Amino acid sequence: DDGTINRERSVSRLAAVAVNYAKAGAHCVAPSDMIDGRIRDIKRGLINANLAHKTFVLSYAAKFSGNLYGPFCYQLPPAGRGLARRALERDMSEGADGIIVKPSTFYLDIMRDASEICKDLPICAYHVSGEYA
Amino acid sequence: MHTAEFLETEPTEISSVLAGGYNHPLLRQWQSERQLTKNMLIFPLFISDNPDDFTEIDSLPNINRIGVNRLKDYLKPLVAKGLRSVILFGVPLIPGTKDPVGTAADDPAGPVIQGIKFIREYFPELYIICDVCLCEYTSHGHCGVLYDDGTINRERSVSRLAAVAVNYAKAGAHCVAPSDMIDGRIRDIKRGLINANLAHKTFVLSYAAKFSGNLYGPFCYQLPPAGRGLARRALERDMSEGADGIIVKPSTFYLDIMRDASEICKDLPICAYHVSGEYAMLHAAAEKGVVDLKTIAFESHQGFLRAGARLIITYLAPEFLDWLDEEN
Amino acid sequence: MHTAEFLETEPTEISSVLAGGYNHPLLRQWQSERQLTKNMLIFPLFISDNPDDFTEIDSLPNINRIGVNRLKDYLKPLVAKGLRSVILFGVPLIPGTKDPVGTAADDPAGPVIQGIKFIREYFPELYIICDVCLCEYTSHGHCGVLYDDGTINRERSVSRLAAVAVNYAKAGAHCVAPSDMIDGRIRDIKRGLINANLAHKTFVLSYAAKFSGNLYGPFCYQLPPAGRGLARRALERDMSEGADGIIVKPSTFYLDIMRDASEICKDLPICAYHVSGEYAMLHAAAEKGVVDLKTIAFESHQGFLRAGARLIITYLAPEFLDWLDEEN
Amino acid sequence: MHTAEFLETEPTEISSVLAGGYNHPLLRQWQSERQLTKNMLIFPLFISDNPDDFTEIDSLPNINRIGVNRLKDYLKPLVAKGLRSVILFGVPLIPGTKDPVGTAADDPAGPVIQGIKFIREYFPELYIICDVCLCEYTSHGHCGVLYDDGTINRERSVSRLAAVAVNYAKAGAHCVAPSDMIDGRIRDIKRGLINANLAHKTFVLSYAAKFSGNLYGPFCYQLPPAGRGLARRALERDMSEGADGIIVKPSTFYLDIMRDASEICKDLPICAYHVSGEYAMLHAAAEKGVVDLKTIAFESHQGFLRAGARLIITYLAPEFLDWLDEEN
Numbered sequence A: 001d002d003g004t005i006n007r008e009r010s011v012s013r014l015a016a017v018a019v020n021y022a023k024a025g026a027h028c029v030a031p032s033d034m035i036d037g038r039i040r041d042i043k044r045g046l047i048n049a050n051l052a053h054k055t056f057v058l059s060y061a062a063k064f065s066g067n068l069y070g071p072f073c074y075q076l077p078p079a080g081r082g083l084a085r086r087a088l089e090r091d092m093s094e095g096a097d098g099i100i101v102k103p104s105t106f107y108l109d110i111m112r113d114a115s116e117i118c119k120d121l122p123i124c125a126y127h128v129s130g131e132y133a
Numbered sequence B, C, D: 001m002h003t004a005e006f007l008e009t010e011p012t013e014i015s016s017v018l019a020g021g022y023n024h025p026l027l028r029q030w031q032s033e034r035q036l037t038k039n040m041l042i043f044p045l046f047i048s049d050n051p052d053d054f055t056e057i058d059s060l061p062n063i064n065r066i067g068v069n070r071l072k073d074y075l076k077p078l079v080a081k082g083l084r085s086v087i088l089f090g091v092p093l094i095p096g097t098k099d100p101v102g103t104a105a106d107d108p109a110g111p112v113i114q115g116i117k118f119i120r121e122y123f124p125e126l127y128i129i130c131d132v133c134l135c136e137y138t139s140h141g142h143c144g145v146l147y148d149d150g151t152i153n154r155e156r157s158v159s160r161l162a163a164v165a166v167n168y169a170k171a172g173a174h175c176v177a178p179s180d181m182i183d184g185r186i187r188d189i190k191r192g193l194i195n196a197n198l199a200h201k202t203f204v205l206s207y208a209a210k211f212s213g214n215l216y217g218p219f220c221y222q223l224p225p226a227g228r229g230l231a232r233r234a235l236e237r238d239m240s241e242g243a244d245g246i247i248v249k250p251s252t253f254y255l256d257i258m259r260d261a262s263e264i265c266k267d268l269p270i271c272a273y274h275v276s277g278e279y280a281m282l283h284a285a286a287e288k289g290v291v292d293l294k295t296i297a298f299e300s301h302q303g304f305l306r307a308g309a310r311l312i313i314t315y316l317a318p319e320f321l322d323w324l325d326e327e328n
């Protein structure tokens, strides 16, 4: 009601999509929300949907907010270096098989934390449009 | 008909709810490993030999080639703006001062030393850092004393650099930031300052991490962009050799390295350097409007502070001292 | 009647489902700590003294004893295949060159130095590594300058090895891989290259881990197969002594050690060496059909890359450069 | 004339002299993290359904397909040789026992359970480990209960495996080594043994690390040769799920992984498995003479013990029990 995101709903709704793609024939699903625990659920859903073993959950464990997406909801602070470590460690725990760090070039340190923390998970760098243009 | 499917959930884990730690604008200050002050900003200076100079350089810059008689005006305001430091860059412009050993380097009557005697007196407040390198005062222009139409003569160049290093330090400069990258030049610069009995007054601020990329001028010893291991060995070495603080450059493209710096060199104040490349890249990008300068400037700079740095050498110094004064 | 019993389960834990990270053929590339390129492969060369030589050796080999006048043909193709490096092995075949101090070693007119002057000119592209040892140029043939009908005279042999090491390095070779295993031979080879003012050009690629097993030739200082601790102390030492990169051999039977190598010597490029034994063992095994060569070759080689190595010295080099060109 | 140059040295560092720790033959036993005994060796058994069987398999093997009436002779000697364990492999040969759920699996009258009741009585001394998998007792032959002309039905197959697992364990078997690699099959096999109130008697010896390579038979869920990270996550998981010991296979080509195993699973006895591939590869290699079997056999096996394993599953078991009796 003319406010703030209804977590559990949105999540229940996202996990829904997530699986339909995955039912449709897609190999990977990269949730780009950043709504807490959306991964535990997307993995659980793919499980019941008995697709757990085919789909690669590639989370966006690290989606920060900066003037690099379009010049000028839930989204981690540029200076918050600790959330981002807790936000990875969480998604790793929740089932994520790989993770995404973005933007990239301005957050190599974070990407660096990613590798340490999420050492056994293939890490992916995202060169946001901002950086690009 | 296609209806919105909604999967069946489980109760929310208390360990999936971080979001409340970062909601208010204040908790986004309370999450910053360190907040950006004015006393962090270190302004580079390119003191030219024509004491009447104030020549604009450029690629996107708003940076100059000042002279010792302009200094009391360009510096005046900034300082009243709260500026606490500067990193001197000397610029010989006379027709015959270069040479085979950058002799004109430690030159009691040049840009640098004739700049350092100017501040210590008109602006006793400031804190003087002096870049230490033979690039600019040499005929070939390489950073160091070279051999037979080849490769740098280490021990010589070093013996020569440590020389300058101390003269600055004898002249009245607080800090010396060697920018060569010639092995063991630090052990020597520290030793020299020791005999010269100045060890206890001068802050050796090494450039432990000087990489090579298209970010210094569009297109000698210098670490590879991909070599992540040298850079760790190159820090650990300079830390051992006496360095009291260290420099990582460029910065924004090497936050990971700056990150390694903090771990490795944990007890040494780390400094971030926003190379001109980065700098003129941001302005250039702001003009086409790909982003708004002021926005990208602090993000990029808190990138320094998060990534590890408690100090910064940037050209946006004129700018931040204004900004950091602001609230709403 | 005997019926298939099926126990009663619990809901599947999200932390028991890894399988989706490795299903597509591409995610099995996305899981490899490092993918195998051509620029990793380093080809050993056994340059004989009869410049007309191209004598096949063997146990299972497809390896030879070439001469300096064959070199421009055997090497030609491979290079056009993308080959970027080689590790020279000199072979004196003349009737009187051995001796009490492997004098003929650093010999400006031998296999090795008369090979290294051949490439630097006909194939400037290549990267030359030179094995450094007194085994082959000595009458007794031991690796080092020996005493009275006994045990190696360390300091001598070392003083002598460091000598060769530098001559190669003076001759135009890029890298020097000491293969003795005589204590502190590295500190000295690095020191020598320093005085010789070549420190900054030559890559000391030690053989920090040279064990002893039936894999070099069927059946001096050399580490025990079970001694897992020496090997860690033997690396940490060579790292300290100046080594810029290190070698582990044999390889496939010592992936654990290669693994220790990576941890210990984390910032130093690690190299895997597929000893001839291993090599002729694989061919020999492929002929009886116990496995298909091509299959076992990459598995065994990605064993290097997973286990820790970003470089490799193998005889399957002729082979991989072909293969790595392939897709389906 | 070309004379032997000898560089000028520095006094030998005490920290470059390890060599005295490994000189005598005894100090090379005193350096082994662990010495190889007979009670380490675990012999695999392929108990066929024709109780009169003793059919030789092969690629290089000296391994068979015995029957329950041969068992008291083939086993007799070995045991008197000191053998303390075996890992049973059941072989149904009758024309109609396969099927959609490997029902014939836990079959009180089959190779496996009719083997396990034979030892517990004629050789009470031995220690029985039973491989647990649906590969061999299924029509399709995949390891697990499959779907509609596709991909393994996890939860089913698991529910079915845990079933077998317990029947063996009810039948009188000491250990159960699941060889599937179907996620979470361990949590369940441990849970089952718990309800079945056998948790405290049966040793779950997982195959936490079963990779895929040309070493099992020349040319379902199974980890990639290059995936070094899954294997660490795949161990840490099985350790968590109840596994009391773990298996790494193949072995010699994965000593690094076996190495990770020891670190990760430090408090769990680690076991090395010398897959048939490796095995027939060594014989095959010994025949052409590329090496002498006996030599390569212990090196390769101490490779297990150094790399991390306090147990071993090999076909050279007949052999070592002889050998380990020897001195000179």
Ligand SMILES: [Hg+2]
Residues within 6 Å of the ligand: B133, B134, B135, B136, B143, B179, B180
């Ligand atoms: Hg310079």
Ligand SMILES: [Hg+2]
Residues within 6 Å of the ligand: C133, C134, C135, C136, C143, C179, C180
């Ligand atoms: Hg040698």
Ligand SMILES: [Hg+2]
Residues within 6 Å of the ligand: D133, D134, D135, D136, D143, D179, D180
């Ligand atoms: Hg199986």
